[PDB]
Amino acid sequence: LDNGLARTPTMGWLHWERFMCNLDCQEEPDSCISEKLFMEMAELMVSEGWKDAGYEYLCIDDCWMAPQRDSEGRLQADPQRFPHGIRQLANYVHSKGLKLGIYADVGNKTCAGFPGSFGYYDIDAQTFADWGVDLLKFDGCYCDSLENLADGYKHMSLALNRTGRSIVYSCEWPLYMWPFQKPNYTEIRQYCNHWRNFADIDDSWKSIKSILDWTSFNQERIVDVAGPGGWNDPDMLVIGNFGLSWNQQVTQMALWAIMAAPLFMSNDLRHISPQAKALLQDKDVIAINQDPLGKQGYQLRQGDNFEVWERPLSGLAWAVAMINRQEIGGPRSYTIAVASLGKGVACNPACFITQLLPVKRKLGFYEWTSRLRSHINPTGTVLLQLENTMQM
Amino acid sequence: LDNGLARTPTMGWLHWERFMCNLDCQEEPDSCISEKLFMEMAELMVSEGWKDAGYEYLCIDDCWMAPQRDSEGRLQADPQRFPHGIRQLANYVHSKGLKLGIYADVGNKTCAGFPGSFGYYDIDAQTFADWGVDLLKFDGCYCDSLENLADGYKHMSLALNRTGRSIVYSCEWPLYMWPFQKPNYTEIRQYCNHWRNFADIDDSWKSIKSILDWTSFNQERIVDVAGPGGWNDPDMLVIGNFGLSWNQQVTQMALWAIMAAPLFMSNDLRHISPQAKALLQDKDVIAINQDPLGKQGYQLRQGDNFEVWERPLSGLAWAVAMINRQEIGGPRSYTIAVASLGKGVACNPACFITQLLPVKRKLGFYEWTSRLRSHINPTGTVLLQLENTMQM
Ligand SMILES: *[C@@H]1O[C@H](CO)[C@@H](O[C@@H]2O[C@H](CO)[C@@H](O[C@@H]3O[C@H](CO)[C@@H](O)[C@H](O[C@H]4O[C@H](CO)[C@@H](O)[C@H](O)[C@@H]4O)[C@@H]3O)[C@H](O)[C@H]2NC(C)=O)[C@H](O)[C@H]1NC(C)=O
Ligand SMILES: *[C@@H]1O[C@H](CO)[C@@H](O[C@@H]2O[C@H](CO)[C@@H](O[C@@H]3O[C@H](CO)[C@@H](O)[C@H](O[C@H]4O[C@H](CO)[C@@H](O)[C@H](O)[C@@H]4O)[C@@H]3O)[C@H](O)[C@H]2NC(C)=O)[C@H](O)[C@H]1NC(C)=O
Ligand SMILES: *[C@@H]1O[C@H](CO)[C@@H](O[C@@H]2O[C@H](CO)[C@@H](O)[C@H](O)[C@H]2NC(C)=O)[C@H](O)[C@H]1NC(C)=O
Ligand SMILES: *[C@@H]1O[C@H](CO)[C@@H](O[C@@H]2O[C@H](CO)[C@@H](O)[C@H](O)[C@H]2NC(C)=O)[C@H](O)[C@H]1NC(C)=O
Ligand SMILES: *[C@@H]1O[C@H](CO)[C@@H](O[C@@H]2O[C@H](CO)[C@@H](O)[C@H](O)[C@H]2NC(C)=O)[C@H](O)[C@H]1NC(C)=O
């Protein structure tokens, strides 16, 4: 999408995985979808360093709407859970220096059954713009035809443009095409800043493996379409929640950097371990994800329950990730000729290698003929940055 | 098995899950199966508080043997990796106040292909006794018939008894019978101190869930046979390794206590986090596992992706575990009438309830009319101890 936005993958926070559609503010007040939750989350995004690390979009997912539109046909926030309205919430979010994301659906209903935007694309786009919305996640439930799906996504893109406000446009379009036909990513990219290709993540290592395996299996079809203004979306970061070991968290962080993924945390910033915080705020790994070249990485090799992925970076540098998919035993040794990495360019005539994950450690100069040896934890990843150099 | 041993579930350390069959002492000297590895573990079992917590059996699994028997038909330890021999290693372990466990196979080969004990049951039992062995894990690979399987397990049990040395006898018998015939656990218990029912654990939450689900599915067959001298073995504790989140580690510790499981850690005592160590050394949770009554707990209910397990304890006390199997979202509320717990006697007329996991906190007095409400983390467990007020 040529709107000048998402020149690097968008970073922020999104409530869905951790909080879902909890509407019971009487018995579960700390986890129900309410304006107070998003206000407190904005406060912590500022005070706990999230904004400084680059996370700037505070995003509402489904279940923010009143059950029906108002008399003038406009969407309204739920009067009990969002009594002060989206415009006031957006003013608060902007006052903290953040941007506000919201959720809508291309069909007749959102996935949770709240008012859909079909037949209201223009008025809904203008409503969000008047409210101060800066990002829209546009879902695909309750759409009765591929033609309606495509027309709705294109129309909402055009309507948002017609508002004149810069709004990041996140599409679920390709995923909902799946039961019927293969996506045309040139078109999708023309209309969308990000697009989701695969099923929802949850709080499990199984879901991480599934997203990674689907991505690598389909990488010939999706990797090259990504770039500044248009990204593949492998869904939210779930670091900081309950189902991932430390090494599995490292794997998600490293591979979302390799994949040039949008980085939308879905966790509770009020209750997050210092380790998870340090990983999610890792400056060097974020810098990899945010590399200005904007070329998505890919799986280079797989076999013997190992995977090697790499991503070309600006200025002849490369990121390299090594995953140990064997879920038994201890750290496993893996060796590779550095000439096999980065298309043979990374370490020609030499490269300086810095391990970034699981811990940061300079490994030194590797000449083009040398071999790199590492040990990778079960379900963990070793992430390295290779810097091309003629010295040593 | 009425040999006076395992009056409470045996506790110790076993190398298999973490270290497997690593024979490469040239490239991996600190992780290969060697006399030095077991000496280091013994030293740390003493110095890092494991023995004080109750972990007393330091156990060798497969891949300790020389490729062939000696001239006199006896098993020998690998001359390069165990240069001083098992008897000497056992002397060292005993000098630390610990006990030594070893591994053999009922069939013609061990699962890793080393000498099996078929045709050598008596000589192998006497060899182990002469060496000072205190525990035998007896595997089931390379056995060509159910009759040979049963005959071998019984024969080895009798041979161990005839040596006159007290040796804990751990059998894989039921597991290797199951695909063909249902085990008679009265008989198995007559011959074995522990028996494995289900497939090997590995370093994953998936393996934990499978073991728990098989246990609850089969609990009518296996729960009542367990007791002092004879336990169901759901395989090793894998806390402290790489594949489990904190809440999944809590679930394994809590449910191995509920199940009156032998507690055999398989980890690296040289590299273990303070969190994992404090959980594995949890005095109150170990006390539940080691309760002298020795009545195995059971699954009381399941539904809405929740499980409630309970275990009767000595002196009118009960342990209760609540598991959240929903792997998305946040801590989920679960409520139950305390009159439904402990067969209706735990809290009649009242009980004092203490949460032990994930953190210890006294919850207070609960009357027979009361309801207990808890929030349980996804893939985590809340473990409670209930003390009837007539014992207070
Ligand atoms: C509505 O849609 C239209 C397109 O249909 C869109 O207009 C486009 O806006 C982008 C971003 O402002 C324009 O791209 C710029 O083009 C000018 C031409 O000289 C350049 O100066 C810009 O370069 C800078 O910014 C780039 C980032 O986009 C950097 O890569 C670059 O290094 C410079 O820093 C930039 O290329 C594009 O020309 C127009 N296209 C048109 C007018 O046809 C408009 O923004 C949309 N409006 C809303 C509200 O979404
Ligand atoms: C070989 O097999 C035989 C036959 O099964 C086996 O003999 C058994 O040994 C155990 C313990 O050595 C005996 O259990 C004892 O039973 C008597 C009752 O007659 C009790 O008084 C004993 O009390 C112990 O427990 C007390 C707490 O209750 C403790 O204060 C203290 O530790 C006491 O020692 C104990 O329960 C069992 O009776 C015999 N059975 C027979 C038939 O003799 C023998 O141990 C096996 N040998 C080897 C080397 O495995
Ligand atoms: C939302 O529902 C309306 C009404 O059910 C859909 O409009 C119908 O669309 C079908 C085929 O698309 C036509 O055959 C009907 O004649 C339409 N009925 C009316 C009253 O317009 C509409 O397509 C639905 N929107 C989406 C996105 O699925
Ligand atoms: C996929 O959709 C794209 C976007 O419309 C198609 O490529 C464009 O086609 C239009 C229509 O002829 C041209 O005006 C553009 O110049 C094309 N753009 C590019 C970048 O090629 C493309 O043909 C479609 N592919 C398939 C297989 O349907
Ligand atoms: C399961 O095994 C037990 C022990 O071998 C059997 O119990 C014995 O049954 C015999 C009858 O053949 C009785 O004389 C004994 O008193 C029982 N106990 C002991 C300790 O021997 C039981 O019958 C077996 N059940 C099945 C279905 O095979």
Ligand SMILES: *[C@@H]1O[C@H](CO)[C@@H](O)[C@H](O)[C@H]1NC(C)=O
């Ligand atoms: C071991 O091998 C011999 C020779 O093939 C065979 O007769 C015997 O039954 C085998 N034992 C077991 C337990 O499989």
Ligand SMILES: CN(C)C[C@H]1N[C@H](CO)[C@H](O)[C@@H]1O
């Ligand atoms: C795009 N997937 C398939 C479903 C989406 N619907 C939910 C809101 O109801 C979440 O946004 C979830 O991402």
Ligand SMILES: CN(C)C[C@H]1N[C@H](CO)[C@H](O)[C@@H]1O
């Ligand atoms: C009982 N299971 C099915 C196989 C066993 N063989 C391995 C040693 O080679 C481990 O002891 C593992 O527990």
